[PDB]
């Protein structure tokens, strides 16, 4: 595949309400250090939980694009399903489709995860988790058109924008 150009930098579970999904996060563009710094340990710990959401509307999306203009201040990741065998993969993929993509599209929202530094109740990083949508297609077309062509309307996925705040 072409997922050697977009290496896996994190592997674990996402959570949303009472649902979970096993994913691999592929580095697309920006500053990979933000992924290492912002994402949790996945050696059996609690899942990465989406407990907030942001509307997919003009000023919200402008704010996300704002942090994406300099390569050191953001990280763009692509989330794809994974599992221990084909049967597990189908089930994890159905979870991603039904409990994450369908839900966020129906609410017209991106997931939001604020990541604090220990000792500070000010957010250090924000994870912005998009379903396939006009915004993700725009930026994936700009930054990784080969990757977008391989997944668009073909493979369920999420786009994750990590911003240091």
């Amino acid at each position: 595949q072409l997922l050697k150009k977009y290496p896996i930098v994190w592997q674990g579970l996402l959570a949303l309400k009472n649902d979970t999904a096993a994913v691999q996060l592929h580095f697309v563009s920006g500053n990979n250090v933000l992924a290492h710094r912002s994402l949790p340990l996945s050696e059996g710990g609690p899942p990465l939980r989406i407990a907030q959401r942001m509307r997919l509307e003009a000023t919200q999306l402008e704010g996300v694009a704002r942090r994406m203009t300099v390569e050191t201040d953001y990280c763009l990741l692509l989330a794809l399903p994974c599992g221990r065998d084909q049967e597990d993969v189908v089930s994890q993929t159905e979870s991603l489709k039904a409990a994450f993509i369908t839900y966020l599209q129906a609410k017209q929202a991106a997931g939001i995860i604020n990541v604090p530094n220990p000792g500070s109740n000010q957010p250090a990083y924000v994870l912005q988790i998009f379903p396939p949508c006009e915004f993700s297609e725009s930026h994936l077309s700009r930054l990784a058109p080969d990757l977008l062509a391989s997944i668009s309307n073909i493979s369920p996925h999420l786009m994750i924008v990590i911003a240091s705040v």
Binding site: K17, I50, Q52, R53, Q60
Partner: peptide
């Protein structure tokens, strides 16, 4: 701005 999930 944000809002909490269910």
């Amino acid at each position: 701005s944000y809002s909490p999930t269910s």
